[PDB]
Design a protein. Structure first.
Length: 361
C-alpha cells in the first residue's frame, strides 16, 4: 500500500495530532508500505523526506495548487486525513480528493457540536469520508448518530518500549521525590494553576520535592507565582522525545491536572508506558485511560486540595504505587503501536481495493 496522510498542524510545535501522524507513518513504513505526509510549512525541524509542505497559512492559492498536485500525482491507495475542521489543510484535502478516504477525529466536545458540524454545510465533504476513526466510544457513537453510518474507535498509539527502556536522567530518581508535569503550562486548561495551588501542601510533606516541568511557557510568570516555592520547580524546556521519555521514567508521579479540552489522555498513556504512577484530573477521557481508577489515581476536577492529598498519598505509600505501576504497565499494551496500527490497517483495507486510487475532484 501507498498511504497519503494529511496533518493540519505544523510540525514546528509538539502536539497530539502531529505526534500521531509522524509516528504512524514510520510504523506503516517499518511494515513495508509507502507513506506520504502532507502538513503546513514546518521551517524549524528535521523532517524525513516523505513529509511534504503545503505552504504556510496567512491558506493561499499555492496551497490549493499543492494539495491538488499532491493528490493527483500521489497514486494513493488511501488518503488518511486527521482532524478535518473547517478551515484547515485537512478540510482542503477532503474537498479536493475523491475515493478511499479515511479520517481520524482527534478532538470533540459534545454530541451537539458533532451532529451540527457533520449535519452542517460541510456535510457533502463529510459524507466522502469512507472510514471514520474516532478516539473514544462516545465520540464514535456521536458520529454514527450524526451521519447514520459506521464509525470505529481506535485509541491513538505510542511506542511503549521507547518509554519503558528510556534511560533515567542524570541524578534521578530523587531522594526528595519528584513530580512531573507535561504541557503548554500557560493555557489554563492544562491545569498548571491546580498543581500550583497544591504545591504548598506538597512541599510541607516532602521539603525536597521537585516539580519537573516539560513544555513551552513563560517561566518567569510561573516562578513569580510559586512565590516562596519557585526553587522547587525545574524547567526542562520543550525537550525532544528521547529526553521526555527519560524525564518521564525518572519521575515518581506524573501529574495531569487538566481542566478540560482533552479528548484522549495520551500523555497519561506515556506515563503508564514508562512505569511512572499517574495521578490525574478525572476528565471523561482520563478516566478511560486510568480505567475508572484501577490503573492510576483519579481526583475531582478543579480541586487543588484533593490533588495534594492525592500526590502525597501516592508518594509516601510505596505498595500503592507499585500496584498502580504494575496494573498500568499491564493495561498500557492496549495503546502500543502494534495493536493500534493493526486497527487502522483494517480500516485502510475495508476502504481500499485494487485499481481504486484517490483522485482530484
Ligand atoms: N518531546 C516533547 N513532546 C511533547 C511536548 N509537549 C507535548 N508533547 C507530546 O505532545 C503530545 C500531545 O500532548 P499534549 O501537548 O498535552 O496534547 P495536545 O496536543 O495539547 O492535545 C491533543 O492531544 C491530547 C493528548 O491525547 C488530547 O487529549 C487532545 O484532545 C488533543 O487531541 C504528547 O504525545 C506529548 O508527549 C514537549 O515539550 N516535548
Amino acid at each position: 500500500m501507498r498511504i497519503g496522510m494529511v496533518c493540519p498542524y505544523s510540525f514546528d510545535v509538539p502536539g497530539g495530532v502531529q505526534s500521531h501522524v509522524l509516528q504512524l507513518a514510520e510504523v506503516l513504513r517499518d511494515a513495508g508500505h509507502e507513506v506520504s505526509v502532507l502538513a503546513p510549512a514546518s521551517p524549524h525541524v528535521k523532517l524525513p523526506d516523505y513529509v511534504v509542505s503545503g505552504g504556510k497559512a496567512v491558506f493561499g492559492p499555492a496551497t490549493h495548487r499543492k494539495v491538488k498536485k499532491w493528490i493527483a500525482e500521489g497514486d494513493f491507495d488511501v488518503l488518511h486525513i486527521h482532524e478535518p475542521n473547517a478551515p484547515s489543510l485537512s478540510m482542503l484535502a477532503l474537498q479536493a480528493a475523491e475515493g478511499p478516504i479515511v479520517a481520524t477525529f482527534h478532538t470533540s466536545t459534545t454530541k451537539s457540536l458533532t451532529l451540527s458540524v457533520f449535519q452542517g454545510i460541510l456535510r457533502p465533504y463529510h459524507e466522502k469520508i469512507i472510514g471514520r476513526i474516532a478516539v473514544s466510544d462516545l465520540a464514535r457513537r456521536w458520529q454514527m448518530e450524526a451521519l447514520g453510518s459506521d464509525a470505529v474507535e481506535i485509541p491513538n498509539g505510542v511506542d511503549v518500549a521507547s518509554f519503558a527502556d528510556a534511560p533515567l536522567l542524570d541524578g534521578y530518581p530523587r531522594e526528595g521525590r519528584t513530580v512531573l508535569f507535561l504541557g503548554r503550562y500557560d493555557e489554563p486548561r492544562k491545569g498548571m494553576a491546580v498543581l500550583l495551588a497544591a504545591l504548598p501542601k506538597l512541599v510541607a510533606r516532602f521539603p525536597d520535592v521537585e516539580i519537573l516541568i516539560v513544555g513551552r511557557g513563560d517561566e518567569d510568570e510561573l516562578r513569580e507565582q510559586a512565590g516562596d516555592l519557585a526553587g522547587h520547580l525545574r524547567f526542562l524546556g520543550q525537550v525532544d522525545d528521547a529526553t521526555k521519555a527519560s524525564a518521564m521514567r525518572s519521575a515518581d508521579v506524573y501529574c495531569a491536572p487538566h481542566l478540560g479540552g482533552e479528548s484522549f489522555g495520551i500523555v497519561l498513556v506515556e506515563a503508564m508506558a514508562a512505569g511512572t504512577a499517574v495521578v490525574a484530573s478525572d476528565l471523561d477521557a482520563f478516566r478511560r485511560v486510568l480505567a475508572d481508577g484501577d490503573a492510576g489515581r483519579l481526583v475531582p476536577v478543579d480541586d487543588a486540595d484533593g490533588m495534594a492529598a492525592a500526590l502525597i498519598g501516592i508518594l509516601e505509600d510505596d505498595q500503592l504505587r507499585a500496584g498502580y505501576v504494575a496494573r498500568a504497565s499491564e493495561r498500557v499494551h492496549r495503546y502500543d503501536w502494534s495493536v493500534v496500527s493493526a486497527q487502522i490497517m483494517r480500516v485502510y483495507e475495508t476502504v481500499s481495493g485494487a485499481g481504486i486510487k484517490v483522485q482530484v475532484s
